[PDB]
Symmetry: D2
Subunit: 199 residues, 4 copies
Amino acid sequence: MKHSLPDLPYDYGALEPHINAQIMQLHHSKHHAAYVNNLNVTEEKYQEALAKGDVTAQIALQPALKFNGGGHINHSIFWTNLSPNGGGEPKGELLEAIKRDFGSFDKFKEKLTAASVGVQGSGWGWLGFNKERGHLQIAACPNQDPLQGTTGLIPLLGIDVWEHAYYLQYKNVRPDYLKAIWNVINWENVTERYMACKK
Amino acid sequence: MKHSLPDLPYDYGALEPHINAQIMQLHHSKHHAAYVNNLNVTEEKYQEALAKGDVTAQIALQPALKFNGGGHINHSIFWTNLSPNGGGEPKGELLEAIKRDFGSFDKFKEKLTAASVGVQGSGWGWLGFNKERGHLQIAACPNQDPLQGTTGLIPLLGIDVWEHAYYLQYKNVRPDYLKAIWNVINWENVTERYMACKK
Amino acid sequence: MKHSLPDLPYDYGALEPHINAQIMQLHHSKHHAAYVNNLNVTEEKYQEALAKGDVTAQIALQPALKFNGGGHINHSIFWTNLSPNGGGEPKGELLEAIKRDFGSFDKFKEKLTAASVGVQGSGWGWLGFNKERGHLQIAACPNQDPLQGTTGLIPLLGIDVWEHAYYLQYKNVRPDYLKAIWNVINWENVTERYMACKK
Amino acid sequence: MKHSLPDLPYDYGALEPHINAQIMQLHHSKHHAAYVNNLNVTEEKYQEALAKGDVTAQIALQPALKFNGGGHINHSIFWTNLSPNGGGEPKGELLEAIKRDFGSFDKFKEKLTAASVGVQGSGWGWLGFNKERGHLQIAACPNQDPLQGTTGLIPLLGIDVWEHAYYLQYKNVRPDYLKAIWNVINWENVTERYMACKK
Ligand SMILES: [K+]
Ligand SMILES: [K+]
Ligand SMILES: [Mn+2]
Ligand SMILES: [Mn+2]
Ligand SMILES: [Mn+2]
Ligand SMILES: [Mn+2]
């Protein structure tokens, strides 16, 4: 078992004009590719350190493991959260949960937007599921810190607000990017992730 | 006393082909402008909270104050650290200190490059002066955390490795950007900052 | 304003046998007193730095302001959260909220105990109110980071798990302290704080 | 490997009056023992997660691995840094290094004391060796974050300023503990660690 770069499930230009082909190609073929390759490198070092009982060396590898590991986890989810067939609103039980937990779909969108706009530096906004409480929850994460690994929330929808996710097209104006991304959210996927949490 | 956006001391295209005019214009007129304006906003809120003794409100403002305050501090130094008249090596006492503390100028460049390349997410690489020890020191800082405010080191040379500093021109390849930036380092300015530390 | 050490609402021995008199006296008269005194020193330094527009100094003072400010906020709440007349369960709307959000009072105790036991190093366990979601929420905070200032949750009940809160009596056995403190929870105060969050 | 609690190099009462026997016994047999036991549990969980390629689980275990792993690393060094035959000043090349890098032995003590007193919450003060710069360096570390694993500096002398290291004897008065511990520093061990850093 090595970790592998998943293929993007649509063409690089499939999200235009919301997210351009240049961004999608760099983001997938350069950024994600680097995280998974560097993850495998870090994991092999960690296995060596673990088998030798070298605790210092394990601890020294944690930043790279969290960063590259998180990068792989986060982007793998992100690509499935987007789709040319996306946008609009979810339906069914997910929609019911959104209304119940956030008041309305628009109030939810404002809350996830606010979380995403509010990241200072690099990071992600998330809609997650709190297994303990049995309800939806919004959280922000710095850098590539992954949601489940660092908070326990099960990821449903992630919004990447690293500058590489938007800068070529939207420059400094992160809010223009967050307005555009709502048009390509794959609610079919977010719904599947939500229904997998409930039983 | 309000904080103010300092004018850039050369034309937006003065650093071409090392850093392009589009980057310089966005970086100064959008990014820095936002930090100083948001700094002034945060500072006024903080003065209000301070005068009321509202400790909760002071603490809630710290992230914005450090981020925008640091953004203003960092970029103000950064613009003076670059120049169309830059590149090459420093001379005099700065050069002597570099050789003494790092072995050689090239060994120093490798160490500051390594610090800058090593930032995971957004941040800065710094050459600083340790007043206590009386010598040079390299450090990295996350996001806009400023060097003197968070470590006590006096900043001499800063390298911005936020994606907005390089992405339009160099895309994901941060090492191409760090190779290019050596050509525009204003050693006259770094020398002035160094001599101001010594007495 | 010039912050002051609040009077303890009861005798130093009033929470025996659950928290001994030596601990209460130290905790109030030395620890909380130090936070107040250092908060006042830091706030005066911040006033000087604001007047000069010294952003570096403002940032350098943040750790002392969060630590000592947070220490004052947290302990001022903590004293009111305990009582010689405390223990048992709350009643009315707070108990209804606890049952709705955590399943039962005993499951709530389990979760707040677990958050408090889980703190690695110094910190606090909290029951808070989430104003946006209109429900209760458990969180943990490191060091003296205060709940409202760092998370937006309104504090209802805090459990101090700094070693100074229990060590003289319980030594390393934090879970024994956690079991004992349920006997002195002032549910009247927690109820007042909860009702204040609602209109 | 299966990590083990090392035997203490002396009797629990051998550092009296400076660190009392009750503290040493607790510190070794309960605190350090817990770090070892929890390190072993966490390392077995990491082995399971590596075998499955569960990156989320790997990341979720990082806090426990750094905390307990760091706790084992730090305390294993600390015991060897103290001795009933300790105190006074080092000699030879280590004393020459201390004088060169800090001005004098008394100025070195001032600086390491100040780093150790300055820790807000739980942590450690360290004298370390910087291999790249070929000189001594003082640093502070939060919680159980280990020196080498988090900074690259090689540990020479550690001062534990967790409340459990002093509280039963010194209560809140950390500076008194800091003054007393100079009487039991095992400069032979610190010297061995220093000579090992050089060729
Ligand atoms: K297309
Ligand atoms: K030009
Ligand atoms: Mn990304
Ligand atoms: Mn910048
Ligand atoms: Mn306390
Ligand atoms: Mn300890």
